[PDB]
Amino acid sequence: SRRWFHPNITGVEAENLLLTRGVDGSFLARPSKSNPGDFTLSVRRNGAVTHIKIQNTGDYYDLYGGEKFATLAELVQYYMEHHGQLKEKNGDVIELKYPLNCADPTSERWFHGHLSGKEAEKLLTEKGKHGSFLVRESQSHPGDFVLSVRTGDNDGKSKVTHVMIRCQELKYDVGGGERFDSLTDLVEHYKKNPMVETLGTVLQLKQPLNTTRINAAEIESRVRELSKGFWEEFETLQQQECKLLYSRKEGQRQENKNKNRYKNILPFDHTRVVLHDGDPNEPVSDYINANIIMPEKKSYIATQGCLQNTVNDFWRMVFQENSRVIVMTTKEVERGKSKCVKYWPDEYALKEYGVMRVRNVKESAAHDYTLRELKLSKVGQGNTERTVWQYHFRTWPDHGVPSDPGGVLDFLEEVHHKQESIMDAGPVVVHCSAGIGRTGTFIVIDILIDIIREKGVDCDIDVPKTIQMVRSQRSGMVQTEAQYRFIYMAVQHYIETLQRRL
Numbered sequence: 001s002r003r004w005f006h007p008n009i010t011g012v013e014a015e016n017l018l019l020t021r022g023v024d025g026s027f028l029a030r031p032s033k034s035n036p037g038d039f040t041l042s043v044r045r046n047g048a049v050t051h052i053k054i055q056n057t058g059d060y061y062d063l064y065g066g067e068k069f070a071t072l073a074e075l076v077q078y079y080m081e082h083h084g085q086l087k088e089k090n091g092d093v094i095e096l097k098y099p100l101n102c103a104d105p106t107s108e109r110w111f112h113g114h115l116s117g118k119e120a121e122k123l124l125t126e127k128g129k130h131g132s133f134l135v136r137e138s139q140s141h142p143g144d145f146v147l148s149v150r151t152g153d154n155d156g157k158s159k160v161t162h163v164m165i166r167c168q169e170l171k172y173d174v175g176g177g178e179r180f181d182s183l184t185d186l187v188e189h190y191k192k193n194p195m196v197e198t199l200g201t202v203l204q205l206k207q208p209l210n211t212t213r214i215n216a217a218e219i220e221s222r223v224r225e226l227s228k229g230f231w232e233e234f235e236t237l238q239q240q241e242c243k244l245l246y247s248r249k250e251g252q253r254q255e256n257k258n259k260n261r262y263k264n265i266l267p268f269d270h271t272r273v274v275l276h277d278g279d280p281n282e283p284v285s286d287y288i289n290a291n292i293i294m295p296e297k298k299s300y301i302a303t304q305g306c307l308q309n310t311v312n313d314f315w316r317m318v319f320q321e322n323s324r325v326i327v328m329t330t331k332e333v334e335r336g337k338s339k340c341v342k343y344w345p346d347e348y349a350l351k352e353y354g355v356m357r358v359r360n361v362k363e364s365a366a367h368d369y370t371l372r373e374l375k376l377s378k379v380g381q382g383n384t385e386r387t388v389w390q391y392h393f394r395t396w397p398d399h400g401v402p403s404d405p406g407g408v409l410d411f412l413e414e415v416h417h418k419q420e421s422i423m424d425a426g427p428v429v430v431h432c433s434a435g436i437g438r439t440g441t442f443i444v445i446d447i448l449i450d451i452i453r454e455k456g457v458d459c460d461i462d463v464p465k466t467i468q469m470v471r472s473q474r475s476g477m478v479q480t481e482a483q484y485r486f487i488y489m490a491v492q493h494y495i496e497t498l499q500r501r502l
Protein backbone atom coordinates (compact mmCIF):
# COMPACT_ATOMS: atom_id res chain seq x y z
CA SER A 1 0.00 0.00 0.00
CA ARG A 2 3.01 2.13 0.91
CA ARG A 3 5.11 -1.00 1.65
CA TRP A 4 5.37 -2.54 -1.94
CA PHE A 5 9.04 -1.38 -2.08
CA HIS A 6 11.54 -4.00 -0.85
CA PRO A 7 14.95 -2.39 -0.21
CA ASN A 8 17.23 -5.35 0.63
CA ILE A 9 15.89 -8.02 -1.67
CA THR A 10 17.51 -9.86 -4.65
CA GLY A 11 15.89 -10.95 -7.91
CA VAL A 12 15.83 -14.59 -6.68
CA GLU A 13 14.03 -13.68 -3.49
CA ALA A 14 11.52 -11.35 -5.24
CA GLU A 15 10.57 -14.17 -7.61
CA ASN A 16 10.07 -16.75 -4.91
CA LEU A 17 8.09 -14.23 -2.86
CA LEU A 18 5.73 -13.58 -5.75
CA LEU A 19 5.48 -17.31 -6.59
CA THR A 20 4.77 -18.40 -2.96
CA ARG A 21 2.98 -15.37 -1.41
CA GLY A 22 1.28 -13.72 -4.44
CA VAL A 23 -1.07 -14.44 -7.32
CA ASP A 24 -1.44 -13.13 -10.85
CA GLY A 25 -1.40 -9.37 -10.52
CA SER A 26 0.87 -9.37 -7.50
CA PHE A 27 3.83 -7.04 -7.78
CA LEU A 28 6.69 -5.35 -6.00
CA ALA A 29 9.51 -2.96 -6.73
CA ARG A 30 13.17 -3.21 -5.63
CA PRO A 31 16.51 -1.50 -6.25
CA SER A 32 19.21 -3.13 -8.40
CA LYS A 33 22.26 -3.97 -6.24
CA SER A 34 25.51 -2.56 -7.75
CA ASN A 35 23.61 -0.70 -10.53
CA PRO A 36 23.43 2.91 -9.42
CA GLY A 37 19.83 4.14 -9.47
CA ASP A 38 18.30 1.34 -11.52
CA PHE A 39 15.11 -0.31 -10.17
CA THR A 40 12.97 -3.27 -11.06
CA LEU A 41 9.19 -3.67 -11.02
CA SER A 42 8.56 -7.44 -10.52
CA VAL A 43 5.08 -8.63 -11.50
CA ARG A 44 3.35 -12.01 -11.44
CA ARG A 45 1.51 -12.75 -14.69
CA ASN A 46 -0.06 -16.19 -15.64
CA GLY A 47 1.91 -18.22 -12.98
CA ALA A 48 5.28 -16.75 -14.04
CA VAL A 49 7.16 -13.60 -13.02
CA THR A 50 8.13 -10.71 -15.23
CA HIS A 51 10.80 -8.17 -14.30
CA ILE A 52 10.62 -4.68 -15.66
CA LYS A 53 13.49 -2.23 -15.60
CA ILE A 54 13.13 1.29 -14.40
CA GLN A 55 16.02 3.72 -14.89
CA ASN A 56 16.68 7.05 -13.20
CA THR A 57 19.76 9.03 -14.33
CA GLY A 58 18.49 12.12 -12.60
CA ASP A 59 15.55 13.59 -14.53
CA TYR A 60 12.71 11.05 -14.01
CA TYR A 61 11.92 7.33 -13.64
CA ASP A 62 11.82 5.71 -17.03
CA LEU A 63 9.83 2.53 -16.99
CA TYR A 64 10.67 0.31 -19.98
CA GLY A 65 7.57 0.09 -22.29
CA GLY A 66 5.58 2.37 -19.97
CA GLU A 67 5.85 6.10 -19.27
CA LYS A 68 8.16 8.41 -17.34
CA PHE A 69 7.27 9.28 -13.67
CA ALA A 70 8.26 11.76 -10.98
CA THR A 71 8.08 9.13 -8.19
CA LEU A 72 7.74 5.35 -7.92
CA ALA A 73 4.58 5.85 -5.83
CA GLU A 74 3.13 8.01 -8.65
CA LEU A 75 4.08 5.19 -11.09
CA VAL A 76 2.25 2.55 -9.01
CA GLN A 77 -0.85 4.77 -8.57
CA TYR A 78 -0.97 5.37 -12.32
CA TYR A 79 -0.81 1.72 -13.39
CA MET A 80 -2.93 0.42 -10.33
CA GLU A 81 -5.81 2.52 -11.92
CA HIS A 82 -5.05 2.20 -15.70
CA HIS A 83 -5.73 -1.49 -16.41
CA GLY A 84 -4.15 -1.92 -19.79
CA GLN A 85 -1.59 0.89 -20.24
CA LEU A 86 1.39 -1.34 -19.14
CA LYS A 87 2.47 -3.82 -21.85
CA GLU A 88 5.38 -6.11 -22.77
CA LYS A 89 7.44 -5.95 -26.00
CA ASN A 90 4.87 -8.16 -27.73
CA GLY A 91 1.83 -6.14 -26.49
CA ASP A 92 0.42 -8.43 -23.81
CA VAL A 93 -0.89 -6.34 -20.86
CA ILE A 94 0.81 -6.48 -17.48
CA GLU A 95 -1.83 -5.77 -14.78
CA LEU A 96 -0.58 -4.36 -11.44
CA LYS A 97 -3.36 -5.46 -9.09
CA TYR A 98 -2.05 -6.43 -5.55
CA PRO A 99 1.01 -4.87 -3.85
CA LEU A 100 3.24 -7.53 -2.21
CA ASN A 101 4.13 -5.88 1.13
CA CYS A 102 7.63 -5.82 2.68
CA ALA A 103 8.28 -6.39 6.43
CA ASP A 104 11.81 -4.87 6.58
CA PRO A 105 11.64 -1.86 8.97
CA THR A 106 15.08 -0.39 7.99
CA SER A 107 13.37 2.39 5.89
CA GLU A 108 10.98 3.55 8.70
CA ARG A 109 11.82 6.89 10.38
CA TRP A 110 11.18 5.37 13.91
CA PHE A 111 13.50 2.35 13.44
CA HIS A 112 16.94 2.78 15.20
CA GLY A 113 18.08 -0.86 14.82
CA HIS A 114 21.12 -1.73 16.89
CA LEU A 115 20.77 0.81 19.70
CA SER A 116 21.04 0.35 23.49
CA GLY A 117 18.45 1.07 26.17
CA LYS A 118 20.43 3.86 27.86
CA GLU A 119 21.33 5.65 24.63
CA ALA A 120 17.60 5.64 23.62
CA GLU A 121 16.59 7.24 26.95
CA LYS A 122 19.14 10.03 26.32
CA LEU A 123 18.00 10.82 22.73
CA LEU A 124 14.34 11.04 23.91
CA THR A 125 15.55 13.33 26.72
CA GLU A 126 17.58 15.73 24.53
CA LYS A 127 15.80 15.53 21.14
CA GLY A 128 12.36 14.14 22.07
CA LYS A 129 9.01 15.87 22.67
CA HIS A 130 5.73 14.49 24.19
CA GLY A 131 4.66 11.42 22.11
CA SER A 132 8.16 10.91 20.57
CA PHE A 133 9.10 7.23 19.99
CA LEU A 134 11.55 4.78 18.39
CA VAL A 135 11.74 1.02 17.90
CA ARG A 136 15.18 -0.66 18.57
CA GLU A 137 16.59 -4.20 18.91
CA SER A 138 16.43 -5.68 22.38
CA GLN A 139 19.65 -6.56 24.17
CA SER A 140 18.20 -8.59 27.07
CA HIS A 141 16.10 -10.82 24.73
CA PRO A 142 17.78 -11.30 21.31
CA GLY A 143 15.43 -11.60 18.27
CA ASP A 144 13.06 -9.14 19.91
CA PHE A 145 12.58 -5.39 19.76
CA VAL A 146 11.69 -2.55 22.13
CA LEU A 147 9.33 0.40 21.55
CA SER A 148 10.55 3.41 23.54
CA VAL A 149 8.18 6.39 24.03
CA ARG A 150 8.41 9.78 25.69
CA THR A 151 5.25 10.96 27.37
CA GLY A 152 4.46 14.15 29.38
CA ASP A 153 4.75 17.96 29.55
CA ASN A 154 13.63 18.10 32.85
CA ASP A 155 11.97 17.58 36.23
CA GLY A 156 9.58 14.55 36.54
CA LYS A 157 6.63 15.75 34.43
CA SER A 158 7.80 13.55 31.54
CA LYS A 159 9.09 10.00 31.40
CA VAL A 160 10.25 7.31 29.01
CA THR A 161 8.32 4.00 28.87
CA HIS A 162 9.90 0.89 27.22
CA VAL A 163 7.57 -1.76 25.70
CA MET A 164 8.92 -5.16 24.72
CA ILE A 165 7.89 -6.44 21.30
CA ARG A 166 8.29 -10.19 20.98
CA CYS A 167 9.11 -11.84 17.67
CA GLN A 168 7.54 -15.31 17.48
CA GLU A 169 7.44 -17.49 14.34
CA LEU A 170 7.59 -14.52 12.01
CA LYS A 171 5.01 -12.27 13.82
CA TYR A 172 5.27 -9.31 16.23
CA ASP A 173 3.18 -8.59 19.37
CA VAL A 174 3.36 -6.50 22.61
CA GLY A 175 2.65 -9.47 24.93
CA GLY A 176 -1.07 -10.05 24.19
CA GLY A 177 -3.91 -9.50 21.69
CA GLU A 178 -3.01 -9.02 18.09
CA ARG A 179 0.08 -10.60 16.40
CA PHE A 180 1.38 -8.41 13.48
CA ASP A 181 3.06 -9.42 10.20
CA SER A 182 5.52 -6.46 10.37
CA LEU A 183 6.80 -3.91 12.93
CA THR A 184 5.20 -1.31 10.65
CA ASP A 185 1.80 -3.05 11.07
CA LEU A 186 2.30 -3.14 14.79
CA VAL A 187 3.40 0.52 15.11
CA GLU A 188 0.56 1.66 12.81
CA HIS A 189 -1.90 -0.31 14.98
CA TYR A 190 -0.75 1.12 18.32
CA LYS A 191 -0.53 4.65 16.87
CA LYS A 192 -4.22 4.42 15.88
CA ASN A 193 -5.14 2.58 19.10
CA PRO A 194 -2.63 3.63 21.82
CA MET A 195 -1.65 1.42 24.77
CA VAL A 196 -2.90 2.73 28.12
CA GLU A 197 -0.63 2.20 31.13
CA THR A 198 -2.12 0.36 34.09
CA LEU A 199 -2.59 3.67 35.97
CA GLY A 200 -3.84 5.62 32.92
CA THR A 201 -0.93 7.27 30.99
CA VAL A 202 -1.60 6.94 27.26
CA LEU A 203 1.46 5.89 25.22
CA GLN A 204 0.73 8.28 22.37
CA LEU A 205 2.97 7.59 19.35
CA LYS A 206 2.90 11.10 17.82
CA GLN A 207 6.17 11.50 15.88
CA PRO A 208 9.48 9.58 15.46
CA LEU A 209 12.73 10.88 16.89
CA ASN A 210 14.60 13.22 14.51
CA THR A 211 18.16 12.00 13.76
CA THR A 212 18.73 13.86 10.49
CA ARG A 213 19.12 17.43 11.89
CA ILE A 214 22.72 18.62 12.44
CA ASN A 215 24.56 21.72 13.44
CA ALA A 216 25.79 23.13 10.09
CA ALA A 217 29.33 23.37 11.52
CA GLU A 218 29.19 19.57 12.21
CA ILE A 219 28.75 18.86 8.44
CA GLU A 220 32.26 17.48 7.78
CA SER A 221 31.78 14.78 10.49
CA ARG A 222 28.28 13.74 9.36
CA VAL A 223 29.26 13.45 5.63
CA ARG A 224 32.21 11.32 6.85
CA GLU A 225 29.87 9.07 8.92
CA LEU A 226 27.39 8.78 5.99
CA SER A 227 30.30 7.71 3.71
CA LYS A 228 31.29 4.58 5.73
CA GLY A 229 25.18 5.61 5.20
CA PHE A 230 23.78 7.92 2.51
CA TRP A 231 21.88 5.03 0.89
CA GLU A 232 19.87 4.28 4.08
CA GLU A 233 19.13 7.93 4.81
CA PHE A 234 17.98 8.45 1.24
CA GLU A 235 15.90 5.27 1.29
CA THR A 236 14.14 6.44 4.50
CA LEU A 237 13.34 9.78 2.81
CA GLN A 238 12.14 8.00 -0.34
CA GLN A 239 9.79 5.85 1.77
CA GLN A 240 7.97 9.04 2.87
CA GLU A 241 6.96 9.88 -0.76
CA CYS A 242 3.86 7.66 -0.19
CA LYS A 243 2.53 10.62 1.81
CA LEU A 244 2.66 13.10 -1.17
CA LEU A 245 0.19 11.81 -3.75
CA TYR A 246 -1.69 15.15 -3.93
CA SER A 247 -4.04 15.74 -6.79
CA ARG A 248 -2.81 16.95 -10.17
CA LYS A 249 -6.20 17.20 -11.86
CA GLU A 250 -5.70 20.45 -13.86
CA GLY A 251 -2.59 18.89 -15.47
CA GLN A 252 -4.67 15.77 -16.37
CA ARG A 253 -7.42 17.74 -18.19
CA GLN A 254 -7.85 17.10 -21.93
CA GLU A 255 -7.34 20.78 -22.74
CA ASN A 256 -3.91 20.74 -21.04
CA LYS A 257 -2.25 17.42 -22.21
CA ASN A 258 0.00 18.90 -24.94
CA LYS A 259 1.33 21.48 -22.39
CA ASN A 260 3.15 18.81 -20.43
CA ARG A 261 6.57 17.64 -21.68
CA TYR A 262 5.81 14.20 -20.11
CA LYS A 263 2.13 13.35 -19.77
CA ASN A 264 2.36 11.97 -16.18
CA ILE A 265 4.75 14.50 -14.66
CA LEU A 266 2.35 17.17 -13.58
CA PRO A 267 2.14 20.03 -11.16
CA PHE A 268 0.10 19.65 -7.98
CA ASP A 269 -3.17 21.58 -8.01
CA HIS A 270 -2.51 23.11 -4.60
CA THR A 271 0.77 24.84 -5.67
CA ARG A 272 0.42 25.18 -9.49
CA VAL A 273 1.15 28.58 -11.05
CA VAL A 274 -2.19 29.92 -12.36
CA LEU A 275 -2.04 32.14 -15.41
CA HIS A 276 -4.61 34.98 -15.52
CA ASP A 277 -5.45 37.52 -18.19
CA GLY A 278 -5.19 35.25 -21.20
CA ASP A 279 -6.96 34.91 -24.55
CA PRO A 280 -10.80 34.67 -24.22
CA ASN A 281 -10.55 32.50 -27.42
CA GLU A 282 -8.36 29.68 -25.90
CA PRO A 283 -10.27 26.74 -24.29
CA VAL A 284 -8.04 26.78 -21.15
CA SER A 285 -5.38 29.56 -20.90
CA ASP A 286 -4.69 29.36 -17.14
CA TYR A 287 -2.36 26.36 -17.20
CA ILE A 288 1.40 25.87 -17.15
CA ASN A 289 3.50 22.97 -15.82
CA ALA A 290 4.97 24.89 -12.99
CA ASN A 291 4.72 25.08 -9.17
CA ILE A 292 5.48 27.72 -6.57
CA ILE A 293 8.04 26.46 -4.03
CA MET A 294 8.01 28.36 -0.74
CA PRO A 295 10.67 27.32 1.80
CA GLU A 296 9.58 26.62 5.43
CA LYS A 297 12.09 35.74 1.72
CA LYS A 298 13.05 34.09 -1.54
CA SER A 299 10.58 31.80 -3.24
CA TYR A 300 11.04 29.80 -6.43
CA ILE A 301 9.01 28.61 -9.38
CA ALA A 302 9.95 25.09 -10.47
CA THR A 303 8.96 24.40 -14.08
CA GLN A 304 9.71 22.17 -17.07
CA GLY A 305 11.68 23.11 -20.19
CA CYS A 306 9.47 24.98 -22.61
CA LEU A 307 7.68 23.25 -25.46
CA GLN A 308 7.07 24.95 -28.79
CA ASN A 309 3.43 25.56 -27.81
CA THR A 310 4.22 26.78 -24.22
CA VAL A 311 6.95 29.48 -24.86
CA ASN A 312 4.29 32.24 -24.84
CA ASP A 313 2.81 30.87 -21.56
CA PHE A 314 6.25 30.72 -20.05
CA TRP A 315 6.74 34.48 -20.61
CA ARG A 316 3.14 35.25 -19.50
CA MET A 317 4.23 33.52 -16.27
CA VAL A 318 7.43 35.45 -15.80
CA PHE A 319 5.61 38.73 -16.35
CA GLN A 320 2.71 37.85 -14.03
CA GLU A 321 4.86 36.67 -11.18
CA ASN A 322 7.26 39.64 -11.58
CA SER A 323 10.26 37.25 -11.80
CA ARG A 324 13.54 38.93 -12.56
CA VAL A 325 15.77 35.83 -12.50
CA ILE A 326 15.63 32.60 -14.54
CA VAL A 327 17.92 29.68 -13.81
CA MET A 328 18.23 27.14 -16.61
CA THR A 329 20.13 23.92 -15.70
CA THR A 330 20.07 21.99 -19.01
CA LYS A 331 21.57 22.55 -22.41
CA GLU A 332 18.81 22.84 -25.04
CA VAL A 333 20.06 19.52 -26.49
CA GLU A 334 21.68 16.62 -24.54
CA ARG A 335 22.41 13.10 -25.86
CA GLY A 336 21.00 14.40 -29.18
CA LYS A 337 17.46 15.11 -27.73
CA SER A 338 15.65 18.40 -27.13
CA LYS A 339 15.48 19.25 -23.39
CA CYS A 340 14.23 22.85 -23.73
CA VAL A 341 13.30 24.95 -26.76
CA LYS A 342 15.04 28.22 -27.16
CA TYR A 343 12.53 30.67 -25.63
CA TRP A 344 14.96 33.69 -25.64
CA PRO A 345 16.09 35.82 -28.65
CA ASP A 346 19.69 35.83 -30.05
CA GLU A 347 22.09 38.44 -28.71
CA TYR A 348 20.96 41.99 -29.78
CA ALA A 349 17.81 40.50 -31.35
CA LEU A 350 14.28 41.24 -30.26
CA LYS A 351 11.29 38.91 -30.52
CA GLU A 352 7.53 38.88 -29.77
CA TYR A 353 6.11 35.87 -27.92
CA GLY A 354 2.35 36.40 -28.03
CA VAL A 355 1.65 39.68 -26.16
CA MET A 356 5.18 39.71 -24.66
CA ARG A 357 8.26 41.31 -26.16
CA VAL A 358 11.78 40.22 -25.11
CA ARG A 359 15.03 41.85 -26.14
CA ASN A 360 18.39 40.08 -25.56
CA VAL A 361 20.51 43.01 -24.58
CA LYS A 362 23.75 41.22 -23.85
CA GLU A 363 25.34 37.79 -23.18
CA SER A 364 28.33 37.14 -20.85
CA ALA A 365 30.10 33.77 -20.94
CA ALA A 366 31.49 32.53 -17.64
CA HIS A 367 33.28 29.23 -17.05
CA ASP A 368 30.20 27.18 -16.02
CA TYR A 369 27.34 29.28 -17.38
CA THR A 370 26.26 32.05 -19.74
CA LEU A 371 24.33 35.13 -18.48
CA ARG A 372 21.71 36.62 -20.79
CA GLU A 373 20.47 40.08 -19.96
CA LEU A 374 16.87 40.12 -21.25
CA LYS A 375 14.31 42.90 -21.35
CA LEU A 376 10.68 41.86 -21.03
CA SER A 377 7.68 44.06 -21.72
CA LYS A 378 4.06 43.87 -22.70
CA VAL A 379 3.46 44.83 -26.27
CA GLY A 380 1.70 48.24 -26.51
CA GLN A 381 2.52 49.30 -22.91
CA GLY A 382 5.67 51.21 -22.33
CA ASN A 383 6.83 51.52 -18.78
CA THR A 384 6.11 47.79 -18.25
CA GLU A 385 9.68 46.94 -19.42
CA ARG A 386 11.77 45.10 -16.79
CA THR A 387 15.14 43.30 -16.88
CA VAL A 388 15.11 39.53 -16.57
CA TRP A 389 18.51 37.97 -15.96
CA GLN A 390 18.80 34.41 -17.37
CA TYR A 391 21.57 32.32 -15.85
CA HIS A 392 22.19 29.29 -18.02
CA PHE A 393 24.20 26.59 -16.32
CA ARG A 394 25.96 24.83 -19.24
CA THR A 395 28.34 22.16 -17.82
CA TRP A 396 26.07 19.82 -15.82
CA PRO A 397 27.21 16.32 -16.98
CA ASP A 398 24.67 14.37 -19.12
CA HIS A 399 24.24 11.62 -16.50
CA GLY A 400 25.05 11.83 -12.77
CA VAL A 401 26.24 14.98 -10.94
CA PRO A 402 29.38 17.17 -11.06
CA SER A 403 32.22 15.58 -9.10
CA ASP A 404 32.83 18.97 -7.43
CA PRO A 405 30.24 21.56 -6.29
CA GLY A 406 32.20 24.83 -6.46
CA GLY A 407 30.81 25.57 -9.96
CA VAL A 408 27.25 25.16 -8.74
CA LEU A 409 27.90 27.16 -5.54
CA ASP A 410 29.53 30.06 -7.48
CA PHE A 411 26.58 30.14 -9.83
CA LEU A 412 23.92 30.26 -6.99
CA GLU A 413 25.87 33.00 -5.10
CA GLU A 414 25.69 35.11 -8.26
CA VAL A 415 21.98 34.26 -8.83
CA HIS A 416 21.37 35.17 -5.20
CA HIS A 417 23.11 38.59 -5.38
CA LYS A 418 21.21 39.53 -8.56
CA GLN A 419 17.86 38.49 -7.05
CA GLU A 420 18.60 40.36 -3.82
CA SER A 421 19.67 43.45 -5.85
CA ILE A 422 16.18 43.97 -7.32
CA MET A 423 13.46 45.50 -5.05
CA ASP A 424 10.38 43.21 -4.82
CA ALA A 425 11.69 40.79 -7.45
CA GLY A 426 9.26 37.89 -7.74
CA PRO A 427 10.18 34.23 -7.37
CA VAL A 428 13.32 32.94 -9.13
CA VAL A 429 12.31 30.75 -12.03
CA VAL A 430 14.22 27.40 -12.14
CA HIS A 431 13.81 24.86 -14.90
CA CYS A 432 15.58 21.88 -16.47
CA SER A 433 13.82 19.30 -18.71
CA ALA A 434 10.97 17.78 -16.59
CA GLY A 435 11.67 20.30 -13.86
CA ILE A 436 12.09 17.90 -10.94
CA GLY A 437 15.66 16.43 -10.81
CA ARG A 438 18.28 19.12 -11.39
CA THR A 439 15.66 21.76 -10.68
CA GLY A 440 15.01 20.36 -7.22
CA THR A 441 18.64 19.80 -6.50
CA PHE A 442 19.51 23.47 -7.33
CA ILE A 443 16.50 24.73 -5.31
CA VAL A 444 17.30 22.58 -2.28
CA ILE A 445 20.96 23.59 -2.28
CA ASP A 446 19.79 27.24 -2.58
CA ILE A 447 17.41 26.94 0.43
CA LEU A 448 20.10 25.42 2.67
CA ILE A 449 22.92 27.87 1.73
CA ASP A 450 20.49 30.70 2.43
CA ILE A 451 19.99 29.55 5.98
CA ILE A 452 23.76 29.42 6.48
CA ARG A 453 24.20 32.82 4.76
CA GLU A 454 21.75 34.47 7.26
CA LYS A 455 22.35 32.47 10.47
CA GLY A 456 26.07 31.78 9.78
CA VAL A 457 27.82 28.54 10.59
CA ASP A 458 26.20 27.79 14.03
CA CYS A 459 22.67 27.02 12.74
CA ASP A 460 20.50 23.88 12.37
CA ILE A 461 20.06 22.21 8.93
CA ASP A 462 18.08 19.08 8.03
CA VAL A 463 18.63 17.93 4.46
CA PRO A 464 15.95 15.20 4.17
CA LYS A 465 13.38 17.35 5.98
CA THR A 466 14.09 20.21 3.56
CA ILE A 467 13.73 17.87 0.53
CA GLN A 468 10.46 16.44 1.97
CA MET A 469 9.01 19.97 2.32
CA VAL A 470 9.92 20.78 -1.29
CA ARG A 471 8.56 17.47 -2.59
CA SER A 472 5.28 18.37 -0.97
CA GLN A 473 5.19 21.35 -3.40
CA ARG A 474 6.22 19.62 -6.68
CA SER A 475 6.30 15.86 -7.39
CA GLY A 476 9.67 14.19 -6.94
CA MET A 477 11.96 17.18 -6.43
CA VAL A 478 15.46 15.72 -6.12
CA GLN A 479 15.45 12.48 -8.14
CA THR A 480 18.42 10.34 -7.13
CA GLU A 481 20.80 9.36 -4.43
CA ALA A 482 23.73 10.95 -6.38
CA GLN A 483 21.92 14.30 -6.28
CA TYR A 484 21.31 13.69 -2.53
CA ARG A 485 24.98 13.19 -1.79
CA PHE A 486 25.81 16.27 -3.95
CA ILE A 487 23.51 18.43 -1.83
CA TYR A 488 25.45 17.40 1.24
CA MET A 489 28.76 17.89 -0.65
CA ALA A 490 27.61 21.38 -1.78
CA VAL A 491 26.67 22.45 1.76
CA GLN A 492 29.87 21.01 3.20
CA HIS A 493 31.92 22.95 0.56
CA TYR A 494 29.95 26.11 1.43
CA ILE A 495 30.61 25.66 5.10
CA GLU A 496 34.38 24.99 4.57
CA THR A 497 34.74 28.21 2.55
CA LEU A 498 33.00 30.16 5.32
CA GLN A 499 35.43 28.90 7.97
CA ARG A 500 38.65 29.36 5.93
CA ARG A 501 37.59 33.08 5.67
CA LEU A 502 37.53 33.17 9.50
Ligand SMILES: Nc1ccnc2cc[nH]c12
Nearest residue numbers: 005072073107235238239
Ligand atom coordinates in the same frame (compact mmCIF):
# COMPACT_ATOMS: atom_id res chain seq x y z
N1 LIG B 1 10.80 3.02 0.03
C1 LIG B 1 10.43 3.63 -1.16
C2 LIG B 1 9.10 3.96 -1.40
C3 LIG B 1 8.76 4.57 -2.59
N2 LIG B 1 9.65 4.87 -3.54
C4 LIG B 1 10.94 4.56 -3.33
C5 LIG B 1 12.09 4.75 -4.13
C6 LIG B 1 13.17 4.25 -3.45
N3 LIG B 1 12.73 3.76 -2.25
C7 LIG B 1 11.36 3.95 -2.16
